[PDB]
Design a protein around this ligand. Structure first.
Ligand SMILES: Cc1c(-c2c(F)cc(C(N)=O)c3[nH]c4c(c23)CC[C@H](C(C)(C)O)C4)cccc1-n1c(=O)c2cccc(F)c2n(C)c1=O
Length: 261
């Protein structure tokens, strides 16, 4: 537990509004640049999140957005994190050489291999919650947070905000989350990266996407992805969770394609 005193925070710029409300840029104890997420009441199970936040502090990796602490002796609670000046990867992609696109995949895969080693599920990996720092390094953010979301539009499988397009068959059929459902989502993320932020299965509704996936249909090769890169993303989408690679394997596959291309 790392309780941050709000008196040690400054509020310097408004970054916008996310799923949980207002996000600000500020400084913590004049030392760290931070993002301050102000968690609107009724949007998150705070008690359950606060228990898990102690586990989230201990997660430390260069490619994971660092949790610095929380402000919980008030409502709304604040989540204090590492500041990523270029915002989310989806908007960064939408605003590159093929080598830079693979380095973005490598960055995320390093973070995911670390989470996989800690048996910590992200649960909602996608370009919208990967963040980009001032040097163009991509880092994974909001890992594990979707388990504490209270809005039905995000939690229900038929909700308007459920990430159907990033979900494997066992999630759509049984809500069975595992390291292998994070692998599936990672493949969709690689597709997003190589498609410069296009929506996956854009031609389909969420209901039509679940049906397409049930028939064995998969996302097509983006033109910026080579055959070797597409083989990696496609390996993430095996119908059987047990036949999907680990993040450890994926990272080795990515490093091989980099050295070769
Ligand atoms: C990421 C995000 C943040 C956000 C955050 F949380 C954490 C940090 C960090 N740790 O530093 C952070 N840093 C910056 C932002 C930001 C935003 C951009 C800033 C600049 C300086 C570049 O203007 C820099 C804040 C509000 C909304 C969203 N946001 C989006 O911007 C977004 C887009 C498409 C699609 C989506 F789904 C999106 N969603 C849902 C969403 O929450």
């Amino acid at each position: 537990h790392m309780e941050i005193d709000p008196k040690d925070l400054t509020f310097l710029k408004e970054l916008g509004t996310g799923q949980f409300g207002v996000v600000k840029y500020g400084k913590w104890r004049g030392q760290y640049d931070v993002a301050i997420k102000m968690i609107k009441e009724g949007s998150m199970s705070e008690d359950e999140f606060i228990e898990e936040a102690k586990v989230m502090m201990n997660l430390s990796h260069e490619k994971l957005v660092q949790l610095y602490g929380v402000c919980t002796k008030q409502r709304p609670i604040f989540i204090i994190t590492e500041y990523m000046a270029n915002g989310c990867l989806l908007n960064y992609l939408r605003e590159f050489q093929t080598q830079q696109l693979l380095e973005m995949c490598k960055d995320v895969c390093e973070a995911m291999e670390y989470l996989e080693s800690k048996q910590f599920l992200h649960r909602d990996l996608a370009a919208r919650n990967c963040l980009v720092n001032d040097q163009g390094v991509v880092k994974v953010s909001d890992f594990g947070l979707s388990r504490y979301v209270l809005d039905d539009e995000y939690t229900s499988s038929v909700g308007s905000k459920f990430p159907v397009r990033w979900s494997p068959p066992e999630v759509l059929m049984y809500s069975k989350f595992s390291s292998k459902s994070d692998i599936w989502a990672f493949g969709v993320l690689m597709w997003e990266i190589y498609s410069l932020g296009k929506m996956p299965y854009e031609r389909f509704t969420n209901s039509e996407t679940a049906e397409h996936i049930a028939q064995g249909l998969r996302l097509y090769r983006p033109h910026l992805a080579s055959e070797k890169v597409y083989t990696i993303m496609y390996s993430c989408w095996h119908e059987k969770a047990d036949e999907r690679p680990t993040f450890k394997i994926l990272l080795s596959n990515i490093l091989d394609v980099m050295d070769e291309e």
